[PDB]
Design a protein around this ligand. Structure first.
Ligand code: MSS
Ligand code: MSS
Ligand SMILES: [Cl-]
Ligand SMILES: [Cl-]
Lengths: 378, 378
């Protein structure tokens, strides 16, 4: 019966243990909602596909000796020591770090993989050096065929490979993170250095980064294809191509797309499922987010199954990779009620009313409208 | 001052003349709304990029002698005469036929191209033989590398080429149309044979089809790249990548996507702009559509600038390539009012509140929330 504190030094003992090898921990929802500004390292979810031996602590790690290779389609490949980043211009970013498998357990029938509820997400601040700023300092130029950034994790400890490719558009905000929430990046969260892509699913934010290559194509590792993909019509304007629930799909590069941009979403933080609340005026609160490319336009709530939707008040109006808090105050008579929340962004993206339309066999990118049932009292 | 009836035999004289060579005609909105079930050939918009000499009539054309080549990545290329289709299984489809430039004039600043309002759309029924059913009858199998259908218009009359590529997924519903709205396909609408792709923008539905090739890549004609594209992150889940309005974009195959799937939309048919209507109860009516891959979930209307949204009643609930009629009845006090409509489909797609976020220099795929201002009387 090993608890989270025993698997990972400094983790809150209440974290749900989804897997021991590799280490997978989920934040209980009540704990997640207690930190609506920023998710602390004590409770932040963990998902290792590949464990790095000795990295199972929230303590920072040493930069000493850590070398990163940069190459591929650049005019002048080079190697740098992580410590050299301390002298370069630094940037900070608050972003939603969300597992592509977050919400997996809401798909029916059951899919393959760690059975997340909604606790495979956090809102965190990374600080470090932008990849573009490093290239600039080193006097390096990208080739015309550089269409992807392909990042490889350390193989120290005889670890298996972990290699992800994201579109070259990600170079705009790509960050070599040395710090998280103002402290040394925790070892277990990729310290001493992690390549982060704001507004991309967690899988892409490569912990313990050792090599960065600019490539003309997606890498052909198993972690790029067939895993961490959903059925799609490539380069057509549909979020995914729906499939029969429960059926195996023959994933290829040409019939599916990677888990890249964080799917637009909204979580209801109050009230909680099954809670009793009082009076007629019921303040519904939560957070909402997208991939940070454009602002949210609205978060809307309905207590009548979608017959009418009421605009919530959002605490910030600018675009952001971090979540945005919202509230909507509703007049409700005593009794059982159900509230749902829906986000809507400036380019028209929103959430499916029934998230199960997105059923896929490894259970990625769930973003169905969240519903909460509770009781209103006198 | 040549009117539409003089440019194209059998067209309603009230059609707006956007261009004489090539021929471009737009349906006035009042006429469009008068036909909420099916748009007749007398009023249906015309957009030729490339005129076919002598095809400027709503009359049907002869199938005699019309040969179509089918080849590329198929095991057994072949040629067929259009008349052979008369003996094969036939299918009909009602679909929104919409110019990718429809709505172009709502972009600010002005973009390049024919200045459509909203009359570059119709709802029509095509009948003919499915491309897949033809391949089956001929005992032909697609190669494993067939990722696109590339269709070429007739060059008769020494006409310039017109070549479009759509994803092989389109093979599911691709139709060799011989009839429109129950009559011989009008010459000016591509008679005697047009390759139609339900739920794809009009540009893709190749009139006077003479060659169909299954190809591994998009064709490299000017009509495929750089035209009929919008900025994008290829194979990422965002409908388009927003750009600064008024700025020229360096279109390539790797930074933009074609005008393929019809963008989700909703049009308000009643009331009309500037109209006075009576009593407190105001019935708002219109149509809505997507690319037909999934059903619409709702059409919603707001008369308070989006503070509250009310679900309309849709006349049909199943998915469709054709538009779906809706109505929402609102209680409104006397005075000036503004109503807006928003569609929402099962995969979460919706419309941008401000359609100008999609500004692109050739003015494609406008689908901003439609607003109508009118007066309520006592
Ligand atoms: N190196 C590395 N990195 C990496 C990995 C591994 O395994 N390795 N994983 C992923 C995932 S998958 Mo699904 O999309 S989520 C996720 C993330 C997590 O984070 P944290 O653990 O820190 O929270 O990470 C990311 N990155
Ligand atoms: N062959 C051909 N086809 C074709 C063409 C040309 O020019 N040619 N155009 C386009 C377009 S461009 Mo924009 O996306 S719209 C459109 C359409 C139209 O139809 P109608 O004329 O029938 O209505 O067609 C289509 N197809
Ligand atoms: Cl997982
Ligand atoms: Cl046009």
């Amino acid at each position: 019966a090993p608890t989270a504190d025993q698997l990972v030094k400094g983790k809150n003992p209440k974290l749900l243990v989804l897997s021991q090898r590799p280490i997978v921990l989920e934040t209980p929802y009540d704990l997640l909602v207690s930190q609506p500004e920023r998710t602390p390292k004590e409770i932040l979810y963990i998902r290792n596909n590949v464990d790095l031996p000795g990295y199972n602590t929230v303590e920072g790690a040493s930069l000493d000796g850590w070398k990163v290779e940069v190459g591929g389609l650049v005019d002048k490949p080079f190697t740098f020591e992580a410590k050299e980043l301390l002298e370069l211009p630094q940037h900070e970013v608050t972003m939603v770090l969300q597992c592509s498998g977050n919400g997996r357990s809401l798909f029916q029938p059951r899919t393959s993989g760690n059975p997340w509820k909604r606790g495979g997400v956090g809102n965190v601040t990374f600080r470090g050096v932008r990849l573009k700023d490093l290239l600039e300092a080193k006097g390096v130029k990208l080739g015309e065929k550089a269409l992807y950034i392909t990042a490889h994790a350390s193989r120290q400890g005889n670890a298996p490979e972990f290699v992800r490719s994201v579109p070259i558009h990600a170079l705009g905000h790509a960050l070599l993170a040395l710090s998280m929430n103002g402290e040394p990046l925790p070892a277990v969260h990729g310290g001493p250095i992690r390549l982060v892509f704001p507004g991309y699913f967690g899988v892409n934010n490569v912990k313990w980064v050792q090599k960065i290559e600019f490539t003309e194509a997606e890498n052909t590792t198993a972690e790029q294809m067939p895993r961490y993909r959903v059925p799609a019509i490539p380069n057509a304007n549909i979020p995914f191509l729906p499939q029969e629930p429960g059926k195996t799909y023959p994933y290829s590069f040409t019939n599916s797309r990677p888990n890249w941009l964080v799917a637009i979403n909204s979580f209801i933080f109050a009230p909680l499922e099954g809670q009793t609340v009082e009076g007629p005026y019921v303040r519904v609160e939560g957070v909402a987010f997208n991939d940070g490319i454009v602002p949210l336009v609205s978060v809307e709530v309905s207590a009548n199954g979608g017959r009418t939707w009421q605009q919530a008040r959002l605490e910030r109006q600018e675009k952001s990779f971090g979540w945005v808090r919202w509230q909507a105050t509703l007049y409700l008579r005593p009794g059982e009620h159900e509230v749902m929340a829906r986000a809507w962004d400036a380019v028209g993206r929103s959430q499916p009313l029934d998230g199960n339309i997105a059923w896929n066999e490894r259970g990625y990118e769930y973003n169905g409208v969240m519903r909460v049932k509770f009781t209103v009292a006198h």
